[PDB]
Amino acid sequence: IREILKMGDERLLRIAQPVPSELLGSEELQRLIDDMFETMHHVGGVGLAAPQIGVDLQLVIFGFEPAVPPTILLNPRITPLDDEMEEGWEGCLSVPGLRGAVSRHRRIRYQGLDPQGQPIDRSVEGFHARVVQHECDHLIGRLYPSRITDFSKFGFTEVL
Ligand code: NI
Ligand code: NI
Ligand code: NI
C-alpha cells in the first residue's frame, strides 16, 4: 500500500520512462504491479498509473468488475479509430473530492506489452476506451482537469 500523489505534486507532470525490456518478467516488476493492485484496490479506484505512486515508468493498471477487463499495460500506444468524441464523468485518486466531465475519443486501438513482454493490441469503445485514455494521460504528465473543456461540469463530488 503506497501513497497516491496528489495534484500539485511535480512528479505527476513527468513524461514517464518506458519500462526497460530487462525488467519484463522480473520479480521487481511483479512487486510493483502487486503494490499497484493493492493500492488501487484499497482506495476503490478503477485504474492507477505508476507515476501516481511516484514511480517513473510507463505502466498502468485498470479493471472494473460497463465492466472492463483487469489489465496491466506497459509502454502503451493509443490510436484513435475515428473522430467521434464523447463526454463522460471522470474522477481520479490524485484529485480527491472532485469529478469533471471530459471529452475523449469514443473508440481507440491500444497497444503495449503485458508484464512478460507479450504484445497487447485491442480495439475498444465507450468506458474501456475512456479508462485507457485517462490512465495513459498520466504517463504524459496530464491530469483530467487539463482535459476539461466545459468548466460548468467540474466540481466537488458531493456537490455534483
Ligand atoms: Ni535496455
Ligand atoms: Ni477488498
Ligand atoms: Ni487518474
Ligand in closest contact with the CA of 7: 3
Q: Report the structure determination method.
A: X-ray
CA of 56 from ligand 1 middle (Å) equals 16
C-alpha cell at 47: 485504474
CA of 158 from ligand 1 middle (Å) equals 46
C-alpha cell at 34: 502487486
Q: What is the DSSP string of 13-60?
A: GSBPBPPPGGGTT-HHHHHHHHHHHHHHHHHT-SEEEGGGGT--BSEE
Resolution to 1 decimal, in Å?
2.1
Question: Which whole-number Å values give the CA distances from 122 to 21, 45, 65, 96, 153, in the listed order?
Answer: 21, 22, 18, 30, 30
List, in sequence order, every residue forming a beta bridge with 77; answer none if it has no partner.
111
**Closest to 110 in 3D by CA, of 141, 140, 73:** 73
Q: Report d(CA 93, CA 138) in Å as an integer.
A: 12
The DSSP output letter for 128 is H
The CATH code belonging to domain 1-160 is 3.90.45.10
Ligand in closest contact with the CA of 43: 2
Neighbours of ion ligand 1 (CB under 5 A): 20
C-alpha cell at 42: 484499497
CA of 99 from ligand 1 middle (Å) equals 39
Ligand in closest contact with the CA of 65: 2
Four-residue CA torsion sign, 86, 155, 45, 110: positive
Return the domain boundaries, the chain. 1-160
Q: How many Cα atoms sit within 13 Å of 88 on the Cβ side?
A: 16
Distance of CA 130 to the CA centre of its chain: 9
CA of 69 from ligand 3 middle (Å) equals 17
Q: Report d(CA 134, CA 102) in Å as an integer.
A: 10
Neighbours of 41 (CB within 10 A): 13
Burial status of residue 46 (CB atoms within 10 A of its CB: 0-12, 13-18, 19 or more): buried
Neighbours of 84 (CB within 10 A): 10
C-alpha cell at 29: 516488476
C-alpha cell at 137: 494521460
Q: Which residues are catalytic?
A: 135
CA of 9 from ligand 2 middle (Å) equals 28
